[PDB]
């Protein structure tokens, strides 16, 4: 059960690099690819994300994609730059200019075949491919436009494999350009059809967390990516380390996705870091269900949970987590749908993340994620009703009905979340 990782664009490759830095440290792999760890539990599932190369060297099963070489050159020079397989760097020269059309139709189409070639070589070397994960942003052009193009191409060649994504949603408080709502709306319509799980990482929340909670006056993209890498590590701990949980991507999707289109999750993490005081199990459970620890700028009390999964890391009383986990149920029992019995899952991993005795990762399938899509839809319509900045896209061959269609599909997605939010037994 191997996973193939893909990171596309500026945002996708930076959060992807941090990810490989974090889990590489947890598995005991050094920047050169040599193992110098203390426990054999680190290696029992190293194959899930790493290939074993000549010389007992471990190489991430990762593909790096971008339409301009800038960020990828930085990655090759970064701390863990030399660990990636050099032939897995696939880049163009021009770029996408924060244009979904360039990444999806013109500039990205020129490069997509070359990317799929590397996918095949990685998949052919898989004993039993389990699925794919993609890291990318939805506000730019390469990760947004070409990223969804890659997903459509992968579902063509591997139609029976799981396709999941860690997608960074744009926010005006952290914005590079104004056409970000356009690109996001066009990308989400693709994710509704061609992904099994999409973790909605909202830059609005990451900023509010760095500023309000962590008290960071001037947050940088590096500060936000520290939160993202920690969460992705927590989400993947159920596959990367050997508990008595037989977790496969498809089995996890079956347990979390009651309806095919409603597969957009709210990530969460606790404690929030950037101290030494030991955190208590009651504190971990109370923080991980708090809105201030959510990676999507949505209020869970404004919607209802379809399914929930809590992952605890460290050595703690498995009895005490159950008591506190069962306790929190009552404090928000109204916010859990009663027509999916026992819809809250709990997993425990004995291995803690770096420099934390105990941590908790939160994955929620809540109808309150609808708030995020409304926000993007509003920003979209504010411009589209005046056809502002459309020339950037029509110049690349797109028609205006493609914008209208994408708009309607997201409003449909919003309405679908609303019917189940009001549904009762």
């Amino acid at each position: 059960r191997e996973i193939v990782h893909i990171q596309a664009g500026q945002c996708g490759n930076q959060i992807g690099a941090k990810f490989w830095e974090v889990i590489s440290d947890e598995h005991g792999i050094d920047p050169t690819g040599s193992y110098h760890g203390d426990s054999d539990l680190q290696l029992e599932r190293i194959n899930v994300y790493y290939n074993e190369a000549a010389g007992n060297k471990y190489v991430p099963r990762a593909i790096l994609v971008d339409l301009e070489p800038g960020t990828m050159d930085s990655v090759r020079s970064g701390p863990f730059g030399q660990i990636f397989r050099p032939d897995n760097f696939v880049f163009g020269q021009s770029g996408a200019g924060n244009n979904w059309a360039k990444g999806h139709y013109t500039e990205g189409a020129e490069l997509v075949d070359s990317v799929l070639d590397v996918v095949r070589k990685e998949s052919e070397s898989c004993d039993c491919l389990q699925g794919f994960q993609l890291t990318h942003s939805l506000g730019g052009g390469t990760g947004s436009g070409m990223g969804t193009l890659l997903i459509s191409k992968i579902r063509e060649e591997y139609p029976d494999r799981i396709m999941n994504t860690f997608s960074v949603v744009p926010s005006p408080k952290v914005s590079d350009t104004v056409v970000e709502p356009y690109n996001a709306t066009l990308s989400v319509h693709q994710l509704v059809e061609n992904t099994d799980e999409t973790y909605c990482i909202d830059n609005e929340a990451l900023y509010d967390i760095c500023f309000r909670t962590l008290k960071l006056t001037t947050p940088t993209y590096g500060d936000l990516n520290h939160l993202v890498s920690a969460t992705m590590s927590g989400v993947t701990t159920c596959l990367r380390f050997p508990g008595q949980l037989n977790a496969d991507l498809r089995k996890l999707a079956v347990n979390m996705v009651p309806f095919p289109r409603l597969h957009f999750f709210m990530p969460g993490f606790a404690p929030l870091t950037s101290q030494y005081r030991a955190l208590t199990v009651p504190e971990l459970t109370q923080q991980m269900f708090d809105a201030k620890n959510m990676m999507a700028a949505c209020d869970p009390r404004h919607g209802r949970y379809l399914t929930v999964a809590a992952v605890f890391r460290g050595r703690m009383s498995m009895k005490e987590v159950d008591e506190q986990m069962l306790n929190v149920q009552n404090k928000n029992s109204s916010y859990f749908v009663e027509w999916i019995p026992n819809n809250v899952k709990t997993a425990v991993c004995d291995i803690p993340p770096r420099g934390l005795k105990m941590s908790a990762t939160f994955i929620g399938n809540s109808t309150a994620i609808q708030e995020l899509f409304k926000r993007i839809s509003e920003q979209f319509t504010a411009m589209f009703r005046r056809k502002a900045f459309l020339h950037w896209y029509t110049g690349e061959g797109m028609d205006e009905m493609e914008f209208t269609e994408a708009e309607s599909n997201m409003n449909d997605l919003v309405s679908e979340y609303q019917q189940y939010q009001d549904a009762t037994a």
């Binding site: 159950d322 008591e323 069962l326 149920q329 009552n330 029992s333 009663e338 019995p341 009762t424 037994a425």
Partner: protein
């Protein structure tokens, strides 16, 4: 904090209990079918006992005893008394009764009816059923044949208990009555008798030769409030409390309510409930039960107490809801779910 659910909206007693629970600041209500509850105030028919006690980390309590129906339906009560060695056919406080289907006792009922006919003994019999509300489907006659045809006139079961022709009549009025007692059985099966009972009194003068009257003989609060003109003369709503009935007994008969009647009451209550204790007890069960019962008694002119029926879903008197409902929460609910004198007489056993 604790959680509960209401599944019987037409319950007067537990509507006050749920109301008093919310005012505590430590109890939260949910919709009818939310399964993560600590307490169920369940429905009256087809309560899903099979779905209780299977929720991890939740102690679940319910306000009904599975199997208690065997004591609260007239036909099953007769069966219980006649076949239970603890009660036996030689039972001194239950009127001679027979269950008659339209297993059956149609012929044995007439065997004792003529043994009294020949001996000139009083042969008044009464027919009853638990399906007829508002005092519908009752008959008191001295000829047996003219009632069996009426029993078969309908397609459900009826019982034939004795008509107590010599009741105790209150004065002034020369009128009839029955006694209602409320008993609470908690999860530990402690038997608590509410200290306050009530006399549900008839306002028409008892008449032996004329059973044609629909009201001269039946004292339930309803049949006297919309079928009689004398509702409320001697006491409010044909309801007299213990302090007065006790004073009347001291003055009129030179005895007390405790000595003459209540000892017999306490004996019947514990006798009936201890009979079915091993069949309904929830001591070592994955869920626990409590239930408040309404025992209806009746006193004859020799001051002997007779049991007529047991109601499993009883209403309370307007003038004791506040005190009684508070006692339930104290003993039945807070005993299992603790928070931050006594009105009950504990019947030991």
């Amino acid at each position: 904090m604790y959680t509960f659910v209401v599944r019987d909206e037409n319950s007067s007693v537990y509507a006050e209990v749920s109301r008093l629970l919310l005012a505590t600041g430590q109890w939260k209500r949910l919709r009818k079918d939310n399964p993560r509850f600590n307490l169920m105030l369940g429905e009256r028919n087809r309560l899903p006992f099979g779905r209780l006690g299977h929720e991890p980390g939740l102690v679940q309590l319910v306000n009904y005893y599975r199997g208690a129906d065997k004591l609260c339906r007239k036909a099953s009560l007769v069966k219980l008394i006649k076949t239970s060695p603890e009660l036996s056919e030689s039972c001194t406080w239950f009127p001679e009764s027979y269950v008659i289907y339209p297993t059956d006792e149609r012929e044995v009922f007439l065997a004792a009816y003529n043994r009294r006919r020949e001996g000139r003994e009083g042969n008044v019999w009464i027919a009853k059923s638990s399906a007829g509300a508002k005092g519908e489907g009752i008959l008191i006659s001295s000829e047996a044949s003219e009632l069996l045809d009426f029993i078969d006139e309908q397609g459900q079961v009826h019982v034939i208990q004795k008509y107590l022709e010599k009741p105790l009549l209150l004065e002034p009025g020369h009128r009839k009555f029955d006694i209602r007692s409320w008993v609470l059985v908690d999860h530990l099966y402690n038997i608590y008798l509410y200290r306050e009972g009530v006399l549900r009194t008839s306002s028409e003068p008892y008449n032996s030769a004329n059973f044609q009257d629909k009201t001269c003989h039946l004292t339930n609060h309803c049949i006297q409030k919309e079928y009689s003109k004398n509702y409320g003369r001697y006491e409010e709503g044909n309801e007299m409390f213990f302090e007065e009935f006790n004073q009347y007994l001291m003055d009129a008969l030179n005895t007390t309510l405790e000595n003459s009647i209540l000892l017999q009451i306490k004996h019947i209550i514990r006798s009936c409930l201890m009979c079915i204790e091993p069949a309904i007890s929830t001591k070592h069960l994955h869920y626990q039960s409590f239930q408040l019962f309404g025992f209806d008694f009746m006193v004859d002119e020799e001051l002997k107490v007779w049991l007529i029926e047991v109601n499993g879903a009883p209403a309370c008197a307007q003038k004791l809801y506040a005190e009684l409902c508070q006692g339930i929460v104290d003993v039945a609910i807070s005993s299992v779910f603790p928070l931050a004198t006594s009105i009950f007489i504990k019947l030991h056993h």
